[PDB]
Design an enzyme around this catalytic site. Sequence first.
Site, mmCIF file in Angstrom:
data_model
loop_
_atom_site.group_PDB
_atom_site.id
_atom_site.type_symbol
_atom_site.label_atom_id
_atom_site.label_comp_id
_atom_site.label_asym_id
_atom_site.label_seq_id
_atom_site.Cartn_x
_atom_site.Cartn_y
_atom_site.Cartn_z
ATOM 1 N N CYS A 1 -35.296 -12.760 30.696
ATOM 2 C CA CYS A 1 -35.253 -14.211 30.648
ATOM 3 C C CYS A 1 -34.340 -14.608 31.805
ATOM 4 C CB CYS A 1 -34.776 -14.728 29.274
ATOM 5 S SG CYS A 1 -33.406 -13.762 28.467
ATOM 6 N N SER A 2 -33.375 -15.501 31.596
ATOM 7 C CA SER A 2 -32.479 -15.755 32.720
ATOM 8 C C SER A 2 -31.374 -14.695 32.796
ATOM 9 C CB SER A 2 -31.875 -17.161 32.644
ATOM 10 O OG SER A 2 -31.259 -17.457 33.896
ATOM 11 N N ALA A 3 -30.663 -14.451 31.695
ATOM 12 C CA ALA A 3 -29.616 -13.426 31.705
ATOM 13 C C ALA A 3 -30.093 -12.085 31.151
ATOM 14 C CB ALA A 3 -28.390 -13.911 30.909
ATOM 15 N N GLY A 4 -31.269 -12.038 30.529
ATOM 16 C CA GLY A 4 -31.739 -10.784 29.988
ATOM 17 C C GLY A 4 -31.021 -10.328 28.732
ATOM 18 N N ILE A 5 -30.489 -11.258 27.918
ATOM 19 C CA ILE A 5 -29.844 -10.856 26.665
ATOM 20 C C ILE A 5 -30.211 -11.754 25.489
ATOM 21 C CG2 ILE A 5 -27.884 -9.797 27.906
ATOM 22 C CD1 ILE A 5 -26.239 -12.351 27.086
ATOM 23 N N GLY A 6 -30.617 -13.001 25.754
ATOM 24 C CA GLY A 6 -30.800 -13.956 24.657
ATOM 25 C C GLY A 6 -32.201 -13.975 24.077
ATOM 26 N N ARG A 7 -33.120 -14.684 24.757
ATOM 27 C CA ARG A 7 -34.532 -14.605 24.380
ATOM 28 C C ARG A 7 -35.052 -13.181 24.503
ATOM 29 N NH1 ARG A 7 -36.614 -19.820 27.933
ATOM 30 N NH2 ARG A 7 -34.978 -21.261 27.176
ATOM 31 N N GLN B 1 -27.757 -14.488 21.762
ATOM 32 C CA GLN B 1 -26.634 -15.279 22.258
ATOM 33 C C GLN B 1 -26.186 -16.389 21.305
ATOM 34 O OE1 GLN B 1 -28.597 -16.003 26.398
ATOM 35 N NE2 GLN B 1 -26.412 -15.841 26.916
#
Length: 281
Positions: A215-221, A262
Site C-alpha cells: 500500500c503506501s507504507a506496506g503495513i496497514g492495508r 495500523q
Amino acid sequence: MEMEKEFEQIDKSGSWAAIYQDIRHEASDFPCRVAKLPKNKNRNRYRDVSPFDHSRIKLHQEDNDYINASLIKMEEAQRSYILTQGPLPNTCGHFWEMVWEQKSRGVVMLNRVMEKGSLKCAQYWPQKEEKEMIFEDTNLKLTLISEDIKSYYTVRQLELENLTTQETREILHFHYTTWPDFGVPESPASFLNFLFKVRESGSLSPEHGPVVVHCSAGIGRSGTFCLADTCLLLMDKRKDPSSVDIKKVLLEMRKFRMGLIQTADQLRFSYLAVIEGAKFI
Ligand SMILES: [Cl-]
Ligand SMILES: [Cl-]
Ligand SMILES: [Cl-]
Ligand SMILES: [Cl-]
Ligand SMILES: [Cl-]
Ligand SMILES: [Cl-]
Ligand SMILES: [Cl-]
Ligand SMILES: [Cl-]
Ligand SMILES: [Cl-]
C-alpha cells in the site's frame, strides 16, 4: 464460529482500542540497522516504517542491496508474502528487480496512486501499451499487455523483461482501487472477492515466489490483506477451525515486519473479513 462470539463481545464491550494497544505492546522489536544507514535515507518512504534486518529482502545486483521490503513466512499456514512500501520515484527499478529476483507472479496494490489529493505511491507501471517503462539502473523493461478494469479492482497483465538476458515473464498486477479515503470498508465483501480473485489467479501458489503486497507504507492495508488470507488458510487446515486466534496470528506476522495493522479499525475489519470469508468458504 466462536470468533463471531468473540467479535460480538469485543463490540459490546467497546474494547477494540484496548486489544489493539495490547498487540502493539507485545509486538516484537528487532534491529533495522541497514534501513537506518545514511545511504538508505532516500529509499524509505516513511522514516517510521523500516524492515527488520533479519527478514529484509536483499537485492542481488552489484550496488546497494537495500529495499524497504520484508519476507513474511507463515510456517503453519504454509504461505509467504513480501510486504513493501509503495515504490518511490527512485526505487521503481529496485521494486521490479525484487519481483524478478524473488520470482513473484503477482503484485497486490491496495491504494490509489493519489488519495485525498496526496501521492501515496509512484506510477511504477505503464498505463499505456505503447509507452513501456525502462528501468535503466536495474536493466529491466516493463510493458502493459492488457488490463481488465472492474468496478472495485483492476487486474493487469504486465510483461517484465530482463534486458540483460532477454528473458520475459508475465506478471499479474492486482489493484484494489476502492479502499475508502478514511477508515475501513463498511463491508468486507469486495475486499474478500478481491482476495479470492488473487487466490484463483494462482499468484499465491508455492510454485511461484512470494506475492508482493504493498500500500503506501506496506503495513496497514497490506497487513489486513495478509492477515485475512493467513487466518482463512488456518481455518481451512486445522481440525478445530475455531482455534485460530487472530491476535496471535498477527503477532506472529509482526515478527517479520513492524506495525502490521495500523489502527483498531483495521483490526476490527480484519476480524470481520475473516469471519465473513470463513462463512463463504
Ligand atoms: Cl551509510
Ligand atoms: Cl491509481
Ligand atoms: Cl511518490
Ligand atoms: Cl465489477
Ligand atoms: Cl483505519
Ligand atoms: Cl489459496
Ligand atoms: Cl495506504
Ligand atoms: Cl492461532
Ligand atoms: Cl504499531
